[PDB]
Scaffold this motif. Structure first.
Motif, PDB file in Angstrom:
ATOM      1  N   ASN A 134       0.829  -1.197   0.000  1.00 31.68           N
ATOM      2  CA  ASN A 134       0.000   0.000   0.000  1.00 31.68           C
ATOM      3  C   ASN A 134       0.869   1.254   0.000  1.00 31.68           C
ATOM      4  O   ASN A 134       0.479   2.255  -0.593  1.00 31.68           O
ATOM      5  N   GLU A 322      -8.601  -2.049   7.133  1.00 34.55           N
ATOM      6  CA  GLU A 322      -7.149  -2.156   7.196  1.00 34.55           C
ATOM      7  C   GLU A 322      -6.712  -3.532   6.678  1.00 34.55           C
ATOM      8  O   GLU A 322      -5.814  -3.633   5.841  1.00 34.55           O
ATOM      9  N   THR A 325      -7.344  -3.958   2.741  1.00 37.41           N
ATOM     10  CA  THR A 325      -6.283  -3.232   2.073  1.00 37.41           C
ATOM     11  C   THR A 325      -5.134  -4.213   1.858  1.00 37.41           C
ATOM     12  O   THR A 325      -4.658  -4.379   0.737  1.00 37.41           O
TER      13      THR A 325
HETATM   14  C1  LIG Z   1      -2.918   3.080   2.208  1.00 34.76           C
HETATM   15  O1  LIG Z   1      -3.720   2.760   3.338  1.00 34.76           O
HETATM   16  C2  LIG Z   1      -4.700   3.716   3.774  1.00 34.76           C
HETATM   17  C3  LIG Z   1      -5.573   2.959   4.745  1.00 34.76           C
HETATM   18  O2  LIG Z   1      -6.032   1.742   4.153  1.00 34.76           O
HETATM   19  C4  LIG Z   1      -5.473   4.270   2.582  1.00 34.76           C
HETATM   20  O3  LIG Z   1      -6.441   5.208   3.041  1.00 34.76           O
HETATM   21  C5  LIG Z   1      -4.486   4.936   1.635  1.00 34.76           C
HETATM   22  O4  LIG Z   1      -5.138   5.622   0.574  1.00 34.76           O
HETATM   23  C6  LIG Z   1      -3.564   3.868   1.063  1.00 34.76           C
HETATM   24  N1  LIG Z   1      -2.661   4.451   0.092  1.00 34.76           N
HETATM   25  C7  LIG Z   1      -2.679   4.072  -1.186  1.00 34.76           C
HETATM   26  C8  LIG Z   1      -1.740   4.789  -2.109  1.00 34.76           C
HETATM   27  O5  LIG Z   1      -3.429   3.184  -1.581  1.00 34.76           O
END
Ligand SMILES: *[C@@H]1O[C@H](CO)[C@@H](O)[C@H](O)[C@H]1NC(C)=O
Ligand SMILES: *[C@@H]1O[C@H](CO)[C@@H](O[C@@H]2O[C@H](CO)[C@@H](O[C@@H]3O[C@H](CO[C@H]4O[C@H](CO)[C@@H](O)[C@H](O)[C@@H]4O)[C@@H](O)[C@H](O[C@H]4O[C@H](CO)[C@@H](O)[C@H](O)[C@@H]4O[C@H]4O[C@H](CO)[C@@H](O)[C@H](O)[C@@H]4O)[C@@H]3O)[C@H](O)[C@H]2NC(C)=O)[C@H](O)[C@H]1NC(C)=O
Ligand SMILES: *[C@@H]1O[C@H](CO)[C@@H](O[C@@H]2O[C@H](CO)[C@@H](O[C@@H]3O[C@H](CO[C@H]4O[C@H](CO)[C@@H](O)[C@H](O)[C@@H]4O)[C@@H](O)[C@H](O[C@H]4O[C@H](CO)[C@@H](O)[C@H](O)[C@@H]4O)[C@@H]3O)[C@H](O)[C@H]2NC(C)=O)[C@H](O)[C@H]1NC(C)=O
Length: 338
Positions: A134, A322, A325
């Motif tokens: 992420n 979370e 993701t």
């Molecule tokens: C990474 O994690 C957060 C929480 O899940 C999310 O809001 C955020 O946009 C993510 N970043 C990307 C680039 O996906």
């Protein structure tokens, strides 16, 4: 009228039949060699329901299956009383460091030493690695940390470079107790003994191995006062802040079925738990639904209760955002060539 449980394996099957006897044919049995296969059977409608872990839920959720009841586990905090009414919270996957190493934050982990319970483990691996993808956007997490101890990977790997084995060159990077740095405990020792800069464990891991709680030599003189959690904010909060400084909540396993046969399962299980649950009518007597000739057959062995969920959540919601993701990104890096 009948609920058809799906057993993955010949031993789950052995239990599922006893269950079916005792239940006077109210629950019968399908079986399959794999879980993904049992899921399918639920889609094909050859089987009604079965209990699944965070990750399999996702798989099955994506195929439009639904959570029904969570599996609550005996804990230190859980009231243990009337648990059927709502889910308990379940482990907090935490990233841990020593207070000393100031530079370390959830943002500056690239090319550090890592300590993992084991590969494919939720808190130890899936969650933390999932959230690093992420960050990086990339899938090359095998090469994110400079070196690591992640039991279950290739001993040759840098992912195994830190693992110590039996300290006689044997059983390096194996997912057993034989590997010195294996498990929550082992990943924490990996941290404590300064082999690695970050350990991916759960909340208690820290507590239960500090301030006298552990008699192990490496653990004798360890103070929570000397370790920090890493939060996603990039903030380093104390050890007591797991609640608002975790990576993710490890999902409770969940019974799962199609919507069309969802509430029937629900209704039928709560009864079977009343007959056969931890303190059901016939548990020490005829059949305990949460005891296993082997281990964790159909349900984890340490199951307090199956719990009425909070309304009608989608898998995305039941799993927490979370976690998804993470599993998502590890499911995108997985199945990469289409
Ligand atoms: C990474 O994690 C957060 C929480 O899940 C999310 O809001 C955020 O946009 C993510 N970043 C990307 C680039 O996906
Ligand atoms: C992150 O991780 C840590 C580590 O697991 C975790 O801490 C633990 O929290 C639980 C719950 O707050 C603590 O449990 C209580 O402990 C006492 C006994 O304490 C001693 O012994 C243990 C070892 O056996 C030591 O670890 C500890 O330091 C003490 O020396 C128990 O008596 C308590 O029993 C209660 O269990 C349930 C709690 O909800 C209920 O069933 C009930 O409240 C129980 O007790 C009582 O209720 C009656 C009504 O008031 C009363 O009349 C009875 O007489 C009775 O007292 C309870 O188990 C546990 O000790 C903590 N462990 C450590 C190592 O600190 C954190 O909670 C966790 N938090 C986060 C951030 O996620
Ligand atoms: C597999 O699944 C079946 C179907 O769900 C379960 O069957 C139930 O079994 C119980 C116990 O054998 C039945 O309960 C009792 O039935 C008595 C007579 O039946 C009539 O009335 C009830 C409602 O009161 C109706 O549900 C039923 O259809 C009949 O018209 C009732 O008199 C009992 O209730 C009374 O007394 C008790 C005890 O004092 C009180 O607590 C109650 O409030 C009430 O005053 C009781 O309901 C139940 O009806 C069965 N369902 C069926 C067949 O319709 C199996 O138990 C299950 N098997 C296993 C092992 O899992």
């Amino acid at each position: 009228t009948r609920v058809v449980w799906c057993a993955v394996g010949p031993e789950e099957q052995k239990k599922c039949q006893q269950w079916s006897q005792q239940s006077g044919q109210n629950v019968t049995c399908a079986t399959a060699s794999t879980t993904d296969d049992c899921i399918v059977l639920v889609l094909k409608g050859e089987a009604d329901a079965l209990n699944l872990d965070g990750g399999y839920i996702y798989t099955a959720g994506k195929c439009g299956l639904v959570p029904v009841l969570a599996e609550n586990r005996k804990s230190s905090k859980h009231s243990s009383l009337d648990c059927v009414l709502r889910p308990t919270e379940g482990y907090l996957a935490v990233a841990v460091v020593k207070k000393a190493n100031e530079g370390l934050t959830w943002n500056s982990l690239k090319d550090k030493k890592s300590c993992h319970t084991a590969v494919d483990r939720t808190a130890g691996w899936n969650i933390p690695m999932g959230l690093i993808v992420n960050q990086t956007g990339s899938c090359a997490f095998d090469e994110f940390f400079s070196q690591s101890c992640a039991p279950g990977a290739d001993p040759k790997s840098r992912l195994c470079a830190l693992c110590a084995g039996d300290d006689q060159g044997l059983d390096k990077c194996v997912p057993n107790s034989k590997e010195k740095y294996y498990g929550y405990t082992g990943a924490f020792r990996c941290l404590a003994e300064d082999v690695g800069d970050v350990a991916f464990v759960k909340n208690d891991t820290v507590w239960e191995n500090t301030n006298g709680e552990s008699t192990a030599d490496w653990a004798k003189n360890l103070n929570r006062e000397d370790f920090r959690l890493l939060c996603l904010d990039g903030t380093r909060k104390p050890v007591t802040e797991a609640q608002s400084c975790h990576l993710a909540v490890a999902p409770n396993h969940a019974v799962v079925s199609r919507s069309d046969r969802a509430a029937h399962v629900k209704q039928v299980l709560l009864h079977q738990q009343a007959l056969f649950g931890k303190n059901g009518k016939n548990c020490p007597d005829k059949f305990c639904l949460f005891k296993s000739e082997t281990k964790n057959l159909l349900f984890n062995d340490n199951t307090e209760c199956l719990a009425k969920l909070g309304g009608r959540p989608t898998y995305e919601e039941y799993l927490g955002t979370e976690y998804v993701t993470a599993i998502a990104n590890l499911k995108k890096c997985s199945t990469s060539p289409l």
